[PDB]
């Protein structure tokens, strides 16, 4: 079980600090790889130049052609 | 097969319960009584019911049956069940007891009984089935 | 090894109370245990108890009345100020009409209400209700 001593504050805090890294969202927010890989770089919006128009096929079981743009 | 369906058996049992006095061991008299007392809209069904009533009456005459019980039969069984011997089987001039039983009686200040006779206990203590 | 004697005694008392027993044997004895039992008895939860005195640490036989729902211990013994008592009362007690938190203060071993009356803090030992 967990240690319940009166002088175990360092152990508890260190263990929690180390086990927070096994949370997907905490590690994603605090590691920096996701921010580097994000094309917007953390911005809510961005401006671009339309390279072309494309059509993406909808995944099954739906059938359609979604109109998109490469920018 | 000649197994009787539950309709015939139920009707026969009810008829024997209600009219035990009027019935007997004759199939034809039984089938004449059945049409008198019961309403059977078929001749073959009446014959089957009468033929089962005769068999059941013979079985009753042989002895008690697991199913129906007649009021007269119940009253006669009461008389057979009030059988009483002239003397009590519990009355014995000598009753054999073990020394431990005598000690238990003595602890209840009943060690002065004259009917008691102390018997020698068994020398060997072997009362278990041999494991194997 | 055994490191808390009050915890073992309270666990034994609670287990015997759940089973409907009339008497409980708790060993080893301790004056902290005697104070806790006296505090419980003053409120009518257990009843009279007898200390059997062998030449090593003693034993206690406690009579039960069936009025005890839960008696427990808090480990470690946390320092409780007089302004933080209400939080422990909310966390540990079932209602505000009954139940007691047991504290060891500089005046002695008592309940939380008696410590409020005497205006003193201390260390929490356990609770019962």
């Amino acid at each position: 079980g967990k240690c319940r001593g009166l002088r175990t504050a360092r152990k508890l805090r260190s263990h929690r600090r180390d086990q927070k890294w096994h949370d997907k969202q905490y590690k994603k927010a605090h590691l920096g790889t996701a921010l580097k890989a994000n094309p917007f770089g953390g911005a809510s919006h961005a401006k671009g130049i339309v390279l072309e128009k494309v059509g993406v096929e909808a995944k099954q079981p739906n059938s359609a052609i979604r109109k998109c743009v490469r920018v | 097969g000649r197994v009787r369906t539950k309709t015939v058996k139920k009707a026969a049992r009810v008829i024997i319960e209600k009219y035990y006095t009027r019935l007997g061991n004759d199939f034809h008299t039984n089938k004449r009584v059945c049409e008198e007392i019961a309403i059977i809209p078929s001749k073959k069904l009446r014959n089957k019911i009468a033929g089962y009533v005769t068999h059941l009456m013979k079985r009753i005459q042989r002895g008690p049956v697991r199913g129906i019980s007649i009021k007269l039969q119940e009253e006669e069984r009461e008389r057979r069940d009030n059988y009483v011997p002239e003397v009590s089987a519990l009355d014995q001039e000598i009753i054999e007891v073990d020394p431990d039983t005598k000690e238990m009686l003595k602890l209840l200040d009943f060690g002065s009984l004259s009917n008691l006779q102390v018997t020698q206990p068994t020398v060997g203590m072997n009362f278990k089935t041999p494991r194997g | 090894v055994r490191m808390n004697v009050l915890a073992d005694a309270l666990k034994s008392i609670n287990n015997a109370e759940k089973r409907g027993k009339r008497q409980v044997l708790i060993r080893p004895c301790s004056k902290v245990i005697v104070r806790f039992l006296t505090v419980m008895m003053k409120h009518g939860y257990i009843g009279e108890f007898e200390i059997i005195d062998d030449h090593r640490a003693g034993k206690i036989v406690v009579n039960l009345t069936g009025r005890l729902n839960k008696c427990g211990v808090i480990s470690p013994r946390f320092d409780v100020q007089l302004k933080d008592l209400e939080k422990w009362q909310n966390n540990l007690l079932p209602s505000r009409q009954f139940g007691f938190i047991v504290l060891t203060t500089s005046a002695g071993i008592m309940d939380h209400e008696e410590a409020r009356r005497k205006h003193t803090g201390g260390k929490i030992l356990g609770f019962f209700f």
């Binding site: - | - | 009518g44 069936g66 009025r67 729902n69 079932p94 209602s95 505000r96 009409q97 009954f98």
Partner: protein, 218 residues
């Protein structure tokens, strides 16, 4: 017309029992639905909580039945819950109503602080379990209201509780278990030994023993 088939029903019909608390005192099981109608009467209101289709796989195909959850109460200290599964919805609802009013328990109400006026909250913290669902009821100050999910709130209101705090753990998406856990938690209020119930109990004549001569006649 009502023709009782049990001794308790005959006693209730012949006006030998004053209140349902007499039956609750002796923990006598209730087997006839007409007793509750006789005592609680018009104060009872019911509400359908869920209609759930269940299916049994057969050789030709699935066979479907419908299960109704019905909660009932008089908003003045009594509450009951019933579950009934049938082929048709209406039959299941009628059966659920009957089964809910059959299993009606009283509710004990207490105070949070100063004991002034009528009781408004639960006497203490009470816990109920059903499946993986755990429900905890905590006393609340007057005027707080019921702080809970929609499903337990209906049962708490029908019981007559005005103020209460609620905690819940487990898969509460199972509506049946969620309702049964809080029903058990509510039922546990009269089973808790508080210090004000420490007085020795004075026994009284049981209705079976008290009215035996009248029962012999009928």
């Amino acid at each position: 017309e009502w023709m009782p088939v049990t001794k308790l029903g005959r006693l209730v019909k012949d006006m030998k029992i004053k209140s349902l608390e007499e039956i609750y005192l002796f923990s006598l099981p209730i087997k006839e639905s007409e007793i509750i109608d006789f005592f609680l009467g018009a104060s009872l209101k019911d509400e359908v909580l869920k209609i759930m289709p269940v299916q049994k796989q057969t050789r030709a195909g699935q066979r479907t039945r419908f299960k109704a959850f019905v909660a009932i109460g008089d908003y003045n200290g009594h509450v009951g819950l019933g579950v009934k599964c049938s082929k048709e919805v209406a039959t299941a609802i009628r059966g659920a109503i009957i089964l809910a009013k059959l299993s009606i328990v009283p509710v004990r109400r207490g105070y949070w602080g100063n004991k002034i006026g009528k009781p408004h909250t639960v006497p203490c913290k009470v816990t109920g379990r059903c499946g993986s669902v755990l429900v905890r009821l905590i006393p609340a100050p007057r005027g707080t209201g019921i702080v809970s999910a929609p499903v337990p709130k209906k049962l708490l209101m029908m019981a007559g509780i005005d103020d209460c705090y609620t905690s819940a753990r487990g898969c509460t998406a199972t509506l049946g278990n969620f309702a049964k856990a809080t029903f058990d938690a509510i039922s546990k209020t009269y089973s808790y030994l508080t210090p004000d119930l420490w007085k020795e109990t004075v026994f009284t004549k049981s209705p079976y023993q008290e009215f035996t001569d009248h029962l012999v006649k009928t």
